[PDB]
Symmetry: C2
Subunit: 99 residues, 2 copies
Amino acid sequence: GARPCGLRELEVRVSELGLGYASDETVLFRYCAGACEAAARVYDLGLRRLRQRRRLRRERVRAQPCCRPTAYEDEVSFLDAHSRYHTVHELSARECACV
Amino acid sequence: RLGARPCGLRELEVRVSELGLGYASDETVLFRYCAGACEAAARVYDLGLRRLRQRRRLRRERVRAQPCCRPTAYEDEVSFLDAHSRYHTVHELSARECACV
């Protein structure tokens, strides 16, 4: 439990993705999930202190690392409704990191 | 909120003391950071990820299904003189570049 930020796999039906595809054919879906406890960055620390001090302009400021894809899979093909092989691009994460 | 302002680089003059990094310096530095809205919106990966989270198919993990305004690059270093005339170097203090991750 509570594992670090990394690549995750899950077999899904294309219809389950909520992309508007009728097909029930399965595709392997890859995604970034996990924890970002790689010690607070000097940038993040400085930002949090300035944030509580009302020094920062009233705006949405993220002073915490995010587990997100740094690269995406080029393409995934599945048989669609019109029975043609349809390609969806950048569906799955290829690489993950804490940004 | 429509028209909140896109994710981008922001600059503000600060004393090194204000950062709370433990340095005994009153030197003014230009602090560069990433702030703003990230309404990408609806990247196929994000749309699929949000939908799978609704079905509770993601193993209970944290999962970040939305883009974040974060630095993609950091300024190499900041150098200053503390009160006791001691030279200090702070690495990766400022954002060099921003993006919706």
